Amino acid sequence: DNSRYTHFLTQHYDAKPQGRDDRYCESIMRRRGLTSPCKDINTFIHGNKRSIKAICENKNGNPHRENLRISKSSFQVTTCKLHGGSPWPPCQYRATAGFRNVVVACENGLPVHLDQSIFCR
């Protein structure tokens, strides 16, 4: 069963994003179902899927902390951070685009979790 991988892609993958500004964040967070209630922080990885899956192997990854994996390559990413006091929609997001390696957890050679702690600031 690979539903967690599918869910990883829904929450954390966007191949070819359209301008990574606040309005990008506000739209994709709605489109991916992450606005009821408003997710506090969420990061999307860009580029191709095969590079992300490779983090699960020696090809593009190293072990990290307690049973996570950290990528060797750097990825284009965009972090969407909720602002305003309210947990409920409409959800306003601030976008932060970036370029660095990423931390995931893998199961059966597929990523199933993105460690959001490296994108908090």
Residue numbers in the entry: 2 to 122
Sentences from the paper on this structure:
Angiogenin (ANG), a 14-kDa basic protein is an angiogenic ribonuclease and member of the bovine pancreatic ribonuclease (RNase A) family (also known as RNase 5). Like RNase A, ANG cleaves preferentially on the 3′ side of pyrimidines and follows a transphosphorylation/hydrolysis mechanism. In addition, the crystal structure of human ANG has revealed that it has an RNase A fold and the catalytic triad (residues H13, K40 and H114) is conserved. The enzymatic activity of ANG is several orders of magnitude lower than that of RNase A towards conventional RNase substrates, but essential for its angiogenic effect.
An important structural feature of ANG is that a part of the active site (i.e., the C-terminal region of the molecule) is obstructed by residue Q117 (part of the pyrimidine recognition site). It has been postulated that movement of Q117 and adjacent residues is required for substrate binding and catalysis. Mutational studies on C-terminal segment of ANG have also shown that shorter side-chain residues or deletion of residues affects the catalytic activity and previous structural studies have revealed that the segment containing residues 117–123 in the wild-type is highly mobile. In the 3D structure of native ANG, R121 forms part of a peripheral sub-site for binding polynucleotide substrates at the C-terminal region’s closed conformation. The ALS associated variant R121C has significantly higher RNase activity (131%) as compared with wild-type ANG. In the crystal structure of the variant, the smaller side-chain of cysteine appears to provide more flexibility for the C-terminal end of the molecule by destabilizing the closed conformation thus providing better access to substrates which would explain the enhanced RNase activity. Similar observations have been reported previously for the R121H ALS implicated variant.
